Design a binder for this molecule. Sequence first.
Ligand SMILES: C#CCOc1ccc([C@@H](N)CC(=O)NS(=O)(=O)OC[C@H]2O[C@@H](n3cnc4c(N)ncnc43)[C@H](O)[C@@H]2O)cc1
Length: 396
Amino acid sequence: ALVPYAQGKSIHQLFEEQAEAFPDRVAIVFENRRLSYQELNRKANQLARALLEKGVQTDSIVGVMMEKSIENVIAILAVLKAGGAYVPIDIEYPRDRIQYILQDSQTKIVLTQKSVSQLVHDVGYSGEVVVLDEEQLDARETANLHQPSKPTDLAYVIYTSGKPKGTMLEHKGIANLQSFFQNSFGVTEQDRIGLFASMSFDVSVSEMFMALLSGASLYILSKQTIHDFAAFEHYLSENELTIITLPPTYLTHLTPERITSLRIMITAGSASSAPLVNKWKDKLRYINAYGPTECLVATIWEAPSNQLSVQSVPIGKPIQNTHIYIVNEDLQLLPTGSEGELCIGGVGLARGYWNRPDLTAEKFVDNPFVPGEKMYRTGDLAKWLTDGTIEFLGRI
Ligand SMILES: C#CCOc1ccc([C@@H](N)CC(=O)NS(=O)(=O)OC[C@H]2O[C@@H](n3cnc4c(N)ncnc43)[C@H](O)[C@@H]2O)cc1
């Protein structure tokens, strides 16, 4: 790779390495409960062995219908360790949408919990249902499994909206992001990282593995904490959280003077205004992160430090091992200042859309610039600036 990363390693392999180096460090926090890296890893291994016994294997797609919680993360890690990929199904989606995802994904096994069992019943799911807080796992072996794995194996299928489509992401993209987070944000095991997004929104993937592939601690925010801006600020300050990713629409309601310990604020998913950036960029490192679900994150713009106010907010430059092409309708490259479609190549590109071969071929085209690879057509309008940053301009 152009930029070094842990090539050849799976997500759970990278997590296991952190658990070996930082066994007694806090890995995950939810309300009054927490687990160390060693405890989290052992519990994930016990559940992974149960999942293997039930038949989970390479490119098994496993539904997860759970409340955000420590146990939710145990389940994700266990699916990966068993060799499968997870499909997160937010339990607050409407019943019609849950049923569509279950049917489209063709998953034969759904991981849930006692408080969600009735919803699994009421959506009519006829596959295998594992109620995790009814399974007896404590007696199972806790060592790592070392199942066969390749970086090109599926890691997760996340649905977006035509009809919702299951976007298929492999391990390699997240391995590259481990290296990106450590190089570009300087993430270390000392960091304390909040988890804000729904597990059905791929921001949550970034947040979870930003912590757990670096030895840092992951603080899963409760619904009560998110629902009250003052409670959110108090939680971040009392727990001395150092990194958080937010929608700009949430950030606009927060008070910088009430957050004590953040060193990085990332916004993602929509544009931040220049006045919002100006309000935060001198209190901490403000980062605008852009990307489609089809590659998680594609570009970032960190507001340059110790500079006067900005009047606009670029989406920045491609992250490591990722390439941006701004092209016309004939996929020809445009010069600086010309508006065109933002297209993406790189190690984090999705495999495509689950059981949508024509749509996949339409959106993941042959990369004209790198023979043998694919390039994703985002439908986003953009242009280059002469300083080499990109301006997001809306939809084509
Ligand atoms: C470090 C770190 C993690 O960083 C990220 C960054 C982006 C993502 C996205 N995958 C989140 C997202 O919104 N995905 S989405 O599929 O629901 O929507 C993608 C579209 O949203 C818009 N978008 C998306 N980020 C922007 C933007 N920063 N400005 C302005 N429009 C945007 C563009 O239209 C994208 O094509 C996740 C993690």
